[PDB]
Curated annotation (Swiss-Prot):
GO biological process assignments: chaperone-mediated protein folding
Protein name as annotated: Protein HGH1
Miscellaneous comment in the UniProt entry for this protein: Present with 20800 molecules/cell in log phase SD medium.
GO CC, one annotated term: nucleus
One Pfam family matching this protein: DUF383
Family that this chain belongs to: Belongs to the HGH1 family.
Domain of life, per lineage: Eukaryota
Keyword terms, alphabetized: Acetylation
GO MF, one example: translation elongation factor binding
Organism, as annotated: Saccharomyces cerevisiae (strain ATCC 204508 / S288c) (Baker's yeast)
Length: 354
C-alpha cells in the first residue's frame, strides 16, 4: 500500500512526484519508515534526486525531502546511501548550506551532523570549488558565494565561517547554524578531522579551534556549547600536540576550558592562587556561574584530564591555578560523575616529573 506510493517518487511527472513526497513525509518518522528502504533503498535515491533537481526542487519539496532524510538518517545503512551512492549530494549539501538565501539551511545542517557519524563524511575536507562565482561542478549549479563573507574556496572553511559568524541569525534570517557544532564534534573524532581543527589554515591564517572557543560561554545555545565542548576534547587526542596548543597565545585555549567550571559565588580561592589564574578568570562578574549542564562540564574536565597526560601540560595547568578551580568545583557541585573526574584530575596534578 505504501509500497505503491513510494514508487511514484521516481515517476516521470513532477506533479506526481510532488504529491507522492507530500503524502510520504509523515510516514518517515514512525515504524512505517521501512518502506523507504524498499528495492535497495530506491526511495532514498529518488528523494535525493528530487532535492538536487535545479528545475523542480522547490523550497517545499527540498524541505520535505530533507525532513525525510533527517528522520531516516538514524539508520547507518541509509547514511551509506546518502554519502556513497551519489557523491554529488554531499557537495550539493554543504554548498547549499553556505548559500545565505537558502531557507532550508538549518534543517540541512541537522542532516549534515547526522551524516558525520560515518567516516565517509571526511570527503568534506577535500570539497572545494574553482571560483567564488556561479559555477557548474559535476552537473551541479553551485550558487555564487558571498565574497564579502567567504574568503575561502574550501567547503570546510565556509562551514566554519557560517558557524562562527552566523549565530543569532547574523548572516541569514533563516538560520543560526547551531547544529554545525555537532558536525564539528563528530568529524573531529577522526584523525584527519582532528588535524583540520589544530592546524593553521591558509584562507585566514588561524587555527580553527580558536574560533570556536568563544561559544563555550554561550548560555542561550546549549547545542553550540555541547558540540564545541566535544570538538575541543577530540582535538586534544594526541598528547604530543598539547605543549604547542597550550602555549600558542593567539589560540589561548585554557581559559575557555576553565570559564564554564568557574563561579563568582561559593568559590573560595586564595589571593595567591587567584593571581595565577588566566586573565579571563580574574575579576569575574558577581553573577558569573558555572555551566548548569553536567555532561558539558564533564566534557571540559575530560579535556583538562587529557592535558594532564604530559608533564609539560601538568606544569602549565598547575601554574595557571587549575587545581584550586577543580577543587571548588568538587566542593560545590554534588554530581557523582563530575566528582569522579575532579579527583582523577587531582590524581594527575599530584605526580611530578618522570
Amino acid at each position: 500500500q505504501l509500497n505503491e506510493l513510494v514508487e511514484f517518487l521516481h515517476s516521470p511527472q513532477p506533479a506526481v512526484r510532488q504529491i507522492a513526497i507530500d503524502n510520504l513525509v509523515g510516514f518517515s518518522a514512525g515504524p512505517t519508515s521501512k518502506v523507504f528502504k524498499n528495492d535497495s533503498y530506491r526511495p532514498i535515491k529518488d528523494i535525493i534526486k528530487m532535492i538536487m533537481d535545479p528545475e523542480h526542487g522547490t523550497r517545499v519539496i527540498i524541505q520535505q525531502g530533507v525532513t525525510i532524510l533527517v528522520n531516516l538518517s538514524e539508520d547507518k545503512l541509509v547514511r551509506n546511501i546518502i554519502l556513497s551512492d551519489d557523491k554529488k549530494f554531499l557537495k550539493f549539501l554543504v554548498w547549499k548550506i553556505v548559500d545565505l538565501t537558502n531557507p532550508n539551511a538549518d534543517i540541512m545542517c541537522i542532516l549534515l551532523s547526522n551524516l558525520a557519524k560515518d567516516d565517509g563524511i571526511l570527503a568534506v575536507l577535500n570539497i572545494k570549488r574553482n571560483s567564488s562565482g556561479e559555477e557548474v561542478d559535476d552537473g551541479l549549479k553551485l550558487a555564487a558565494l558571498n565574497k564579502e563573507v567567504f574568503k575561502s574556496l574550501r567547503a570546510m572553511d565556509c562551514l566554519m565561517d557560517c558557524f562562527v559568524k552566523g549565530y543569532d541569525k547574523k548572516l541569514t534570517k533563516y538560520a543560526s547554524f547551531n547544529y554545525l557544532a555537532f558536525f564539528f564534534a563528530d568529524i573531529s573524532r577522526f584523525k584527519l578531522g582532528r588535524m583540520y581543527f589544530i592546524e593553521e589554515q591558509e584562507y585566514d591564517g588561524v587555527v580553527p579551534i580558536s574560533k570556536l572557543l568563544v561559544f563555550t560561554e554561550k548560555y542561550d545555545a546549549k547545542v553550540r556549547r555541547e558540540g564545541v565542548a566535544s570538538t575541543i576534547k577530540n582535538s586534544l587526542f594526541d598528547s604530543e600536540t598539547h605543549e604547542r596548543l597550550l602555549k600558542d597565545e593567539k589560540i589561548n585555549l585554557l581559559p575557555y576550558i576553565l570559564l564554564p567550571i568557574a563561579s563568582a559565588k561559593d568559590s573560595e580561592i586564595d589571593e595567591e592562587d587567584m593571581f595565577n589564574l588566566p586573565d579571563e578568570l580574574q575579576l569575574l562578574p558577581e553573577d558569573k556561574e558555572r555551566d548548569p549542564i553536567p555532561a558539558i562540564i564533564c566534557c571540559h574536565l575530560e579535556s583538562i584530564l587529557l592535558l594532564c597526560t604530559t608533564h609539560a601540560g601538568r606544569e602549565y595547568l598547575r601554574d595557571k591555578s587549575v587545581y584550586p578551580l577543580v577543587r571548588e568545583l568538587h566542593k560545590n557541585v554534588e554530581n557523582e560523575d563530575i566528582g569522579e573526574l575532579c579527583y582523577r584530575i587531582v590524581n594527575m596534578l599530584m605526580r611530578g616529573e618522570p
